[PDB]
């Protein structure tokens, strides 16, 4: 239906991606203090939009809760430990 496309790193060099759809599509003509400080949708040349930024992560780091609230190496360590863990690995 051509609403979604496959983009490698070589092609990525020719596009311009928006992070969120909604927070990166209209334009300005209050703000929550608690929330993190975001950038802008000022680009009128958006070709593609990210499905979800959390898809930058792989299996291991995807089990980390709030990894955006940790120091980067601490996440690298928990990525390694989830292997040294225990539980049901299969029902059979």
């Amino acid at each position: 239906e051509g609403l979604v496309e496959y983009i490698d790193a070589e092609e990525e060099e020719s596009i311009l991606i928006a992070m969120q759809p909604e927070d990166l599509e209209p334009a300005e003509a209050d703000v929550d203090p608690a929330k993190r400080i975001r950038v802008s949708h000022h680009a009128t040349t958006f070709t593609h939009c990210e499905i979800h930024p959390s898809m930058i992560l792989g299996v291991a780091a995807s089990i980390i809760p709030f990894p955006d609230h940790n120091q980067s190496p601490r996440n690298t360590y928990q990525s390694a430990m989830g292997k040294q863990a225990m539980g049901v690995f299969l029902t059979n």
């Binding site: 051509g2 496309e5 983009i7 020719s14 596009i15 299996v59 995807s62």
Partner: protein
């Protein structure tokens, strides 16, 4: 999580398509005649040249989006470098957007 690796397409339908959509063969290239001409590369093979790449890209992009060109095939246009690189190539890492 969303990463995938290109399995390997056939370059021939694209090469056959390009020549039929404005691609001059390399053997007939005259640089003094076509000095602004965009170089068309398919899997690191300089097949020839294109005089209006703009339209060619428009055609190729929507050809792939329709599925007529495999969705795993990568096609880039570096306007500044006067180049159009296409990859049918197996082994490339891609993501969906």
């Amino acid at each position: 999580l969303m990463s995938c690796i290109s399995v390997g397409t056939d370059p021939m339908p694209i090469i056959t398509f390009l020549s039929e959509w404005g691609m001059e063969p390399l053997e007939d290239y005259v640089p003094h005649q076509s000095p602004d001409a965009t170089r068309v590369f398919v899997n690191g093979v300089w097949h020839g040249v294109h005089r209006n790449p703009a339209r060619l890209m428009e055609t190729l992009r929507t050809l792939r989006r329709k599925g007529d060109i495999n969705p795993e095939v990568s096609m880039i246009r570096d306007i500044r470098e006067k180049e159009l690189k296409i990859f049918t190539d197996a082994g490339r890492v891609y993501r969906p957007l």
